[PDB]
């Protein structure tokens, strides 16, 4: 037992990371087969971002303006193209450590692991959720762009995030691996900011089910609520309204524990209205919303 | 910016994990050079733990009673010995992916990454602290024993923990890689339990320095305290008394930020006495104590 914010093992992604240099800008790229993917902003100087015509900037570049380093080895760039906000550099060598992989675009509320990298080398791994405002709460410094987020299924790496920028509140925005930003964000110097960050209700309920699986049951009660009644309380305290689709995906955990979803909603409603009595659930004095229902099943039963 | 509970990349340790089977017991082992390390309890049946004479149990075993599987491949055991609570199985093949490594024993308050494994295969990675009561807050199920905790320096993996058992409160106990348990715990069915878990004061202060580095400065004030005055407050709220050695290791962060250690103690003292105004530091409504001063420097500057 026990329940922790747990990332996927990073070894499969570590073997994909390379360093990309253009001009005086150095960041990370993702090397899969004979392609290296990286943020298109690598082609900007310091002052190019004011009104960047990425099309004109890339037209002025040739292959030899892109330096790719895999460990100690230079990879020769033999082609380049742009797809949305991502650059694709064709190289003359296929990555011998290419995993089976997919490019996926995730939904708000879903989770993934981040491998933070600098100089094309892995530095740390942590778990993130795509927030309802389409930011992630990352830990990223200068040179981290091109670090990726991913999930693993069996031996298949699903890449879902590439890191591009930091917003004023210290949260982060990026693209899928087709170069399309999550949310309304863009790789330009405009007055962008994260909106209000709503609590992911279905994930809080999933975490309460994790608590029940781990023997924390003090917050359960014998009285049920209605979806409408729960959502009345959810609007205050800044929780996402619970939908029938959200109730649906909590079904497997409800069946496993014997606790009806609307009974868990009644428990959560009591917790919101009356607060936690300095009390811990799974050792935390706060309600956690960065575990999906699938995350809970994986950590409690699936990993075995 | 941003600050997250961040684990080391796990790829170097993933290549060391194997499955060890003895009788009907299956768990994980650590394969380094031509040795596989695993908990000695693998030699017990279900009922052997009541009064286990590990010496007699191991004397009755031969090499062919130990099955080691690395991926799809059986490794042949050619020798066996016991060192404290760890079994060492000599195998006929040296691990081709053996990293440079050290076996280290850590102190309470220090942190490490855990690679949770089942069936000799990696499942997840997360960051832990050795608590003052010599437990860790892990996430471990049946079959996870033999999973290891580690730190990385450059290319050198410092192994510091091997997982053995779970205590009644859902926290965990284990050994260093020489088989010596952390704390008073043993691999026997006795009425063991985690004591009171004190808050790691020096780590909370380190985290407050991380907050200042990240632009959270609202909790700072212009009035200093004394070490004795701070500790008077620290005894209540269940914080470790701050020692001169603890003040010493906060020195580098104090110099970097310009905030004297006793000024940060005054800030922490105010936070404890008056509470946090539903307020966030680094996005958390709780004070975090699972980052060491070295962890903060690594995540804020060192990873670049």
Swiss-Prot record, chains A, B:
Q: Which residues lie on this side of the membrane: Cytoplasmic?
A: 1-304
How is this protein's activity controlled? Inhibited by pyridone-containing alpha-ketoamides compounds 13a and 13b. In turn, alpha-ketoamide 13b (tert-butyl (1-((S)-1-(((S)-4-(benzylamino)-3,4-dioxo-1-((S)-2-oxopyrrolidin-3-yl)butan-2-yl)amino)-3-cyclopropyl-1-oxopropan-2-yl)-2-oxo-1,2-dihydropyridin-3-yl)carbamate) inhibits SARS-CoV-2 replication in human lung cells. Inhibited ex vivo by michael acceptor inhibitor N3. Inhibited ex vivo by compound 11a and 11b.
Residues of the Peptidase C30 domain: 1-304
Covalent cross-link Glycyl lysine isopeptide (Lys-Gly) (interchain with G-Cter in ubiquitin) as placed by the record, residue numbers: 5, 90
Subunit record text: 3CL-PRO exists as monomer and homodimer. Only the homodimer shows catalytic activity. Interacts with host FBXO22; this interaction promotes the proteasomal degradation of nsp5.
| Role summary | Cleaves the C-terminus of replicase polyprotein at 11 sites. Recognizes substrates containing the core sequence [ILMVF]-Q-|-[SGACN]. Cleaves and inactivates human TRMT1, preventing tRNA guanine(26)-dimethylation of tRNAs. May cleave human NLRP1 in lung epithelial cells, thereby activating the NLRP1 inflammasome pathway. May cleave human GSDMD, triggering alternative GSDME-mediated epithelial cell death upon activation of the NLRP1 inflammasome, which may enhance the release interleukins 1B, 6, 16 and 18. Also able to bind an ADP-ribose-1''-phosphate (ADRP).
Give the protein's recorded name: 3C-like proteinase nsp5
Name the source organism: Severe acute respiratory syndrome coronavirus 2 (2019-nCoV)
